[PDB]
């Protein structure tokens, strides 16, 4: 985040795993995996999405 030093809020970042459908409501996304990243406390939410694939090598 690169907004005011005084600005503050909370954004929900959610990992919709594959096969499923991207979430369209905040609610649905909170049910999934998701960080609740407070703008005001830490200027940057990092987060490693995990590796998956049946075919244990993803095709580009």
């Amino acid at each position: 985040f690169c907004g005011s030093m005084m600005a503050t809020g909370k954004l929900l970042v959610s990992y919709a795993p594959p096969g499923a459908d991207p979430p369209k409501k905040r609610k649905e996304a909170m049910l999934g995996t998701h960080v609740i990243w407070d703008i005001g406390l830490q200027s940057s939410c990092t987060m490693v999405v995990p590796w998956i694939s049946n075919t244990t090598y993803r095709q580009t």
Partner: protein, 234 residues
């Protein structure tokens, strides 16, 4: 410093849970010995911080309230567990932060109220699910009463914490399971009830966000359910 609490698929950042209050200083735990006591134990994914839709506190905001477990009658898993199961009992950590700028004077009281019978009657009326219910200063139970014709000033008996903005901007009540029984139907009986009232009226500086958000992060703890498991014999 900011702690980042995790419960599987969910994570909450918290400044400092130094001002955490456990209601009646009793930490919630399971049913002690006092299988045969049918303690179906699914303390797996129903124990993750859920987040209710944030309310917008304003100048003339009277107050808000949520019944628990009610609130989570939809928060995915837990909400499920309150149907495939007849009986259950969960404590809960309620985590209310309300980020505001250094230029917002104000103060909220979060009150956990065991068996919070909000007076002035029809199930749906007293169960606002996940969006909670609001108060009014004259349906909406009277605010300075909490339905029940009580004088506000006494609320503080009930496990409470004050979010005075010019200090901590978060609050964390920790309710343990409380009831006249040892287990119960999680659906038709709301053990607790969280009410948030503004003590000092929200005020701020000229051109500033005139409606600070307040979120509730209810995580059911050490929850359990009845049993379907019967028994056979040769």
């Amino acid at each position: 410093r900011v702690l980042q609490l995790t419960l599987g698929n969910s994570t909450i950042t918290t400044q400092e849970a130094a001002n955490s209050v456990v209601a009646y200083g009793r930490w919630p735990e399971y049913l002690r010995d006092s299988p045969v006591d049918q303690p179906t134990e699914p303390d797996v994914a129903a124990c993750r911080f859920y987040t209710l839709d944030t309310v917008s506190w304003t100048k003339e905001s009277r107050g808000w309230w949520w019944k628990l477990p009610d609130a989570l009658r939809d928060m995915g898993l837990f909400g499920q567990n309150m149907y495939y199961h007849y009986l259950g009992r969960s404590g809960y950590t309620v985590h209310v932060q309300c980020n505001a700028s250094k230029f917002h004077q104000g103060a909220l009281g979060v009150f956990a109220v065991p068996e919070m019978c909000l007076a002035g009657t029809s199930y749906q009326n007293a169960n606002p699910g996940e969006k909670g219910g609001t108060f009014t200063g004259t349906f909406c139970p009277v605010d300075y009463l909490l339905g029940n014709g009580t004088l506000l000033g006494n609320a503080f008996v009930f496990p409470h914490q004050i979010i005075n903005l010019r200090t901590n901007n978060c609050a964390t009540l920790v309710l343990p399971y409380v009831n006249s029984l040892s287990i119960d139907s999680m659906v038709k009986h709301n053990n607790w009830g969280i009410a948030i009232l503004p003590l000092a009226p929200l005020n701020f500086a000229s051109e500033s966000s005139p409606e600070i958000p307040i979120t509730l992060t209810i995580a059911p703890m050490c929850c359990e359910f009845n049993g379907l498991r019967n028994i056979t014999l040769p």
